[PDB]
Design brief:
Layout lengths: L18 H12 L4 H18 L4 H16 L6 H17 L7
PDB class: de novo protein
Keywords: Computational design, DE novo protein
Assembly: monomeric
Length: about 100
């Protein structure tokens, strides 16, 4: 079909993937982060990254769409807001793209 079959929902994924390490990342970021400031850095990153990798633009847009959706409604102070931002950072992580975050 195609090379690099990373995009899939097969049983038992490659590399050390666990909830312990995952929750840890979100726990560290959620510890204290700013959506307003992060939105700028994230928006600028995706914008430039998209120009370099248009093939991933589709996936990148999805992540931003989620973060922007919550950011558009500055009032919902819950897990949805933290998940929106964290979801984007996690998306890029899997993509395996050296970005100014990790």
């Amino acid at each position: 079909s195609m090379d690099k079959e990373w995009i899939s929902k097969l049983p038992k994924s490659p590399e050390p993937w666990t909830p312990e390490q995952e929750e840890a990342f979100l726990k560290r970021f959620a510890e204290k982060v700013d959506p307003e400031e992060t939105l700028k850095k994230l928006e600028e990153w995706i914008k430039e990254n998209i120009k370099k990798y248009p093939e991933y633009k589709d996936e990148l847009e999805v992540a931003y769409n989620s973060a922007k959706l919550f950011l558009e409604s500055p009032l919902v102070e819950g897990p949805g807001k933290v998940r929106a931002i964290g979801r984007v950072l996690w998306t890029i992580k899997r993509l395996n793209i050296d970005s100014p975050f990790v």
